[PDB]
Amino acid sequence: IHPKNRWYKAWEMFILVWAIYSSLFTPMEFGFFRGLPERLFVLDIVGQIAFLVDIVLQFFVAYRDTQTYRTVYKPTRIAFRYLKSHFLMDFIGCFPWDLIYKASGKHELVRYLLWIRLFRVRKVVEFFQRLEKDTRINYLFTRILKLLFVEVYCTHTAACIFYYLATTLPPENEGYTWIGSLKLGDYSYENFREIDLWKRYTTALYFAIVTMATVGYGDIHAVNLREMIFVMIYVSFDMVLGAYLIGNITALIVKG
Amino acid sequence: IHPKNRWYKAWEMFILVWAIYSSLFTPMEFGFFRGLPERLFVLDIVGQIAFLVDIVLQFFVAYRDTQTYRTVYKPTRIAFRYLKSHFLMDFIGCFPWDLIYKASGKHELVRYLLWIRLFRVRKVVEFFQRLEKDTRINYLFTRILKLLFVEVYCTHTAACIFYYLATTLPPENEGYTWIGSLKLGDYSYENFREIDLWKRYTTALYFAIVTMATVGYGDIHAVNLREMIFVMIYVSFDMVLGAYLIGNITALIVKG
Amino acid sequence: IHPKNRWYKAWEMFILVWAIYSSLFTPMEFGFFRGLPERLFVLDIVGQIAFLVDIVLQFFVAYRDTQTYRTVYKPTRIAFRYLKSHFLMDFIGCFPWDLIYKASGKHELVRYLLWIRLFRVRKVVEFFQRLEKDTRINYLFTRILKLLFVEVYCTHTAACIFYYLATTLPPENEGYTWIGSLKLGDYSYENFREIDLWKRYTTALYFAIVTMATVGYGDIHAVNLREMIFVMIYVSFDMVLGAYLIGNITALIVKG
Amino acid sequence: IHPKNRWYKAWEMFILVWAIYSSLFTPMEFGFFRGLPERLFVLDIVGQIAFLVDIVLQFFVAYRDTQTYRTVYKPTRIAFRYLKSHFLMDFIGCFPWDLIYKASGKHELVRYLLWIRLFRVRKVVEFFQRLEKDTRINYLFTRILKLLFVEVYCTHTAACIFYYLATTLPPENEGYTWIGSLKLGDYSYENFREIDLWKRYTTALYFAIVTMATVGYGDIHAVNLREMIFVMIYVSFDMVLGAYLIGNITALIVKG
Ligand SMILES: [K+]
Ligand SMILES: [K+]
């Protein structure tokens, strides 16, 4: 269909909302939750069918050729472009993956793969690129907004992994972990696997946002080797991200 | 009355001092104090009548039209301008609000409303923009001064809220709070509701200025969920504020 | 004498070295030491007579007028300049001030005044100006070097005051202090007034350089109200200093 | 031999890998290891003969004269260039130094000399300069990459020294040290000289990466005087390195 189709824009925004949800919830699902409770099952079904329908619509939509100004309309050409660009990855990240893990003898390697659903963030960067090409905004403000969104997103998906790393150890050796050795005030996170989900998520995101901003109170810190190797990796990338953010903001201020 | 009235400058500078006081004391009043002691009774009344006199004077004063260079004088449209722009908010933030709370069965929701007095910082930013207009100072130095004042002000108004959040919990569950769990040296902040006001304010502002500068010693930290959700919100905004400040300073140096 | 007197350069560098010593040792003398031991007495005498000889030499030197290019040689005007500019402040900070304190009943207010010797840092500032006007170097590199020297100097003079603030409290109430409540490893700084001078200086400068760089480990922190009010003042100025340093470095890189 | 020799490029890239290994392993060898185990015997010999072969090949390679565009070819002047340039240091840092220490009655001063092998990073900066002159990449991206590599390298070589400083103290006075006084979770680093090599390296690099990024959790900190004097030196240089990195990134962003 014509890219300028007015309902196609509404479909794009709907898919954007679903992609935002599926990129903010996938790291939580791999992390805090293990084998999702039966309540959120319908959410999984709805998301997967919605993204499959998006795949079909992409298969049935016309595109603008990049070599020259030529809005092509031949179905085979768009089919080759889609199949060669990213069609395989999205389809692989479209099968219900929780179901496979829950069926095939609860194997952790299967659950180690819903990370591939992170490819849905391509929709978000697509929207950022579209907003850039709009002349209403400036070249740099789009870059700063994109950089800030990426920093905030990597912070949440780093908090999720940082909590996950606490579940790798057996639940007898829980004292030798970032959570389970925590003692804030008069509250001890002894059996952290049994606390409310939101308490654990807030505790794990506290650590991530007092490091992405380089405050580091030190009330929550890595205790194992896995967690140390993860913290050094996280900070060595957040530093470059923050440097880029500061550089872009300064460039916006200088260009006037 | 003409804007160039020489006593009008004196009135503006006097209202500026009152606005500074009412913007640096409102978060303290919502925070550390609860139902202001009888000693400070007269100060509230004096401030409210002073700001009401400012309101009526703003009603009876000429303005400069923004569409074109016209120093207009006709009262009806100056009245309409005042009414639509900000007349409602200042008047709502002009009623004695401590009195209403102390009368109507000490309801916390009433006390949750003096935050509306923060609109008086409009006078401060008005002065900053006026100094921006003056050719005595540069375009960027005004921006750096404004950004530094906003950072320092939000730090104090964040310290006040951070202390307040420790008073939401009942005073039996006092050991699970940012304060009351503190132990500095050989001094334990056990009954923090009973310590001298200035000790509590200094302790709470210490935390705010060792996070606004991103030092984070870690001797004072969030312990509850409210306090964590507040610290993550505070740092995620102070980071952007500091990035903007650094960018503006760098731009001033570059264009220098 | 002629400003281009070749031995006058040697005298200027000699005075510069003495100014370095007297600006890096005055805060230590006000701080860690109280009523200097008899050993360093000759050092005090030599320093004061050296600066008095500098006073008389500057009284007996010619200058170049600032209103226009006029190397004036008339004694009355060259005397009037130094009389009105800084003769008083350089001379009050030239009397032996330790002797007065040790004589007049060991009064602390007298010892609270050798801070006036810090005006000798204007010699270092003038040296930086001399390096600036020289075309051998760039305009910005001089600024970055000056900024880095000021940052490092204020760090040492902040460490000295931070240790001094620990001596204001009586030596019974010593546990309620940043030092005396310290416990690093298995070493407890119990009687901190009796430890070796260099241990105390290194401990106090550790804190200053892990805050001037905004690291803040948190092993050393303010415990009283004096120390908190001092730390908030120190960080709120080191932040601006670091922002200025980063801006100047970025400007040098950009203009390069 | 003509510098444009195609096998000479392969030899240069091979010596580059060896230089990477010898610059990332020398600080570890001076640090964590003391008198390398017999297993790693062959690696040292292979490296030293490889660098000796590089030295003789440099003695038998043609070079480009810097005064004018002249690809000289006469062996005497290439020999003079080598001898006057950095050749003695390469030879001194080519003798097996572990062997000398293990033979000459295990004297620590001999082991204090393999630091001279750090001159091999000259090959890495040679490659960075070659990449700079290649027009494929920009002038600033080369500088940012070089700055980031230097920061990351100095962080590892600072972690190695920070662990080494823990071995200077006798193993009875082990509690008064940054490691050996550590207590992370329920694991106490009591006999730190007996833990696995990789645990100690990760623990010491954790500290270095959470200070090079200025996070400073405070779970690992200096306890002695040696370690404090080292931390103040490390931070006062990492700050300038980070400022330079931010400035270069900002200059790249502004340059468009
Ligand atoms: K920090
Ligand atoms: K800390």
Numbering used by the authors:
A (entry chain C), B (entry chain B), C (entry chain A), D (entry chain D): 58 to 313
Reproduce the article's own wording on this structure:
GORK is a shaker-like potassium channel in plants that contains ankyrin (ANK) repeats. GORK, also known as guard cell outward rectifying K+ channel, is the only outward-rectifying potassium channel in guard cells. In contrast, GORK activation causes potassium efflux, reducing guard cell turgor and volume and in turn stomatal closure. Each protomer has an N-terminal transmembrane domain (TMD, residues 58–313, containing helices S1–S6), followed by three cytoplasmic domains: the C-linker (residues 314–365), cyclic nucleotide-binding domain homolog (CNBDH) (residues 366–510), and ANK (residues 511–724).
We determined the cryo-EM structures of the full-length AtGORK (AtGORKFL, residues 1–820) in an autoinhibited state, along with two ANK-truncated versions (AtGORK623, residues 1–623; AtGORK510, residues 1–510). For the truncated AtGORK510 and AtGORK623, cryo-EM maps at 3.4 Å and 3.2 Å resolution, respectively, were obtained. Both maps showed high-quality density in their transmembrane domain, allowing accurate modeling, while the flexible cytosolic domains remained unmodeled due to their invisibility. Removing the KHA domain while retaining the intact ANK domain in AtGORK (Δ737–820, residues 1–736) led to a slight increase in oocytes currents, whereas deleting the last three C-terminal ANK repeats (Δ624–820, residues 1–623) significantly enhanced current amplitude—reaching 13.3-fold that of the full-length channel at +70 mV. Structural reconstructions of AtGORK623 and AtGORK510 resolved only the TMD portion, with their cytoplasmic regions remaining unresolved due to their intrinsic flexibility. While the absence of density in these regions limits direct visualization of cytoplasmic symmetry, it likely reflects increased structural mobility upon ANK truncation, supporting the conclusion that ANK removal disrupts autoinhibitory interactions and converts GORK into an activatable state. Firstly, the structures of AtGORK623 and AtGORK510 are highly similar, with a root-mean-square deviation (RMSD) of approximately 0.48 Å for their superimposed tetramers. Importantly, the ANK-truncated protomers exhibit strict C4 symmetry, with RMSDs of approximately 0.16 Å/256 superimposed Cα. A comparison of protomers A and B in both AtGORKFL1 and AtGORK623 reveals that the protomers in AtGORK623 closely resemble protomer A in AtGORKFL1, rather than protomer B. This suggests that ANK dimerization results in C2 symmetry in the full-length AtGORKFL1, whereas ANK truncation restores C4 symmetry in the AtGORK623.
